[PDB]
């Protein structure tokens, strides 16, 4: 509801223990690129006129 007004079910963990529930979200910080991988595919094309 909040994200509709403004999270993936696979990315929230819940543990209940001793009358207490800890809800733990994953979050993604900003890194910096160290690797760039380019896959270059040569196709060919039929021209027509």
């Amino acid at each position: 509801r909040k994200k509709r007004d403004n999270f993936p079910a696979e990315d929230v963990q819940v543990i209940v223990e001793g009358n207490e529930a800890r809800i733990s979200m994953t979050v993604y910080p900003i890194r910096s690129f160290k690797k760039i991988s380019v896959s270059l595919v040569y196709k060919q094309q039929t021209l027509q006129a």
Binding site: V16, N19, E20, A21, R22, I23, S24, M25, T26, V27, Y28, P29, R31
Partner: protein, 277 residues
């Protein structure tokens, strides 16, 4: 709860039977349709405080001889479960509640409140008789006392009321788990005089009609349904026959248990954890 229809019927019938038999004009009204001599003979024999004969009530299979002049034999019958709840959840509660009770009480002044005192801790208050409080009256319940603001109510400083309420056992959560059962009990008025058997039948039907309004079978034992057998000799080879007319009383009631839940949760807490992949 678990319930025992036979013991309920015995406990309920015995005092009611006594209180009718000690009261002549009730019998005179119940038997108005019978022959005059039947009516007067029954009223002379069994009825009023001076009555030399007596009626009796008890379960079947005693080891001793009974008052075969007039005796209500109670006889536990069949039953079957009839309706179930989803998950068998008959109800749920936040506070373990006991039986329903009705008690007479009087108001008293205390510290410029009116209070009613009750014999047991009030688990829930259903009704204070003949009173509906406004918000201004600051109605509060605490322990086994009901408390009520004095300021505007001084005329009622000794008002007499009936409190309808229910006990609490303890402060605990749970689920009432169970089902409904439809169950039969037979009752027969034995007498060696056929006209006494017919009068005992009439008196029992009156008693059961009167019983339908009681709190016991308003809250439990609902939908009383009556069936009636032929009049016949119950025993045939004494120096005289013993006669009776059976009636079957059928009740619908709940069988259930308090499944308490110990689990309680009092705080959620949130944390963010970072995935560097």
């Amino acid at each position: 709860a678990i319930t025992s229809v036979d013991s309920y019927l015995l406990s309920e019938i015995k005092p009611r039977l006594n209180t009718v038999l000690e009261n002549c004009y009730i019998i005179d009204e119940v038997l108005k349709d019978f022959d005059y001599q039947t009516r007067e003979s029954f009223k002379e024999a069994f009825c009023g405080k001076n009555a030399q004969h007596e009626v009796t009530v008890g379960f079947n299979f005693p080891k001793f001889k009974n008052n075969y002049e007039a005796h209500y034999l109670i006889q536990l019958g069949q039953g079957q479960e009839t309706k179930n709840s989803l998950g068998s959840i008959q109800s749920s509660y936040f506070e373990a509640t006991g039986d329903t009770l009705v008690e007479s009480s009087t108001a008293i002044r205390e510290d410029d409140k009116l209070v009613f005192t009750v014999s047991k801790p009030i688990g829930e208050l259903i009704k204070v008789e003949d009173i509906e409080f406004a918000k201004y009256d600051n109605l509060q319940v605490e322990g086994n006392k009901v408390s009520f603001k004095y300021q505007t109510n001084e005329d009622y400083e000794n008002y007499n009321a009936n409190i309808i309420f229910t006990e609490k056992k303890n402060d605990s959560k749970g689920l009432v788990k169970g089902f409904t059962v439809e169950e039969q009990v037979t009752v027969v008025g034995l007498s060696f005089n056929v006209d006494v058997a017919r009068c005992l039948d009439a008196v029992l039907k009156m008693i059961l009609i009167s019983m339908r309004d009681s709190i016991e079978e308003q809250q439990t034992f609902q939908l009383q349904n009556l069936s009636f057998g032929d009049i016949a000799p119950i025993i045939e080879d004494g120096d005289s026959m013993i006669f009776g007319r059976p009636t079957i009383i059928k009740y619908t009631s709940s069988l259930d248990l308090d499944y308490t839940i110990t689990q309680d949760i009092n705080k959620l807490t949130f944390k963010e954890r970072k995935d560097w992949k």
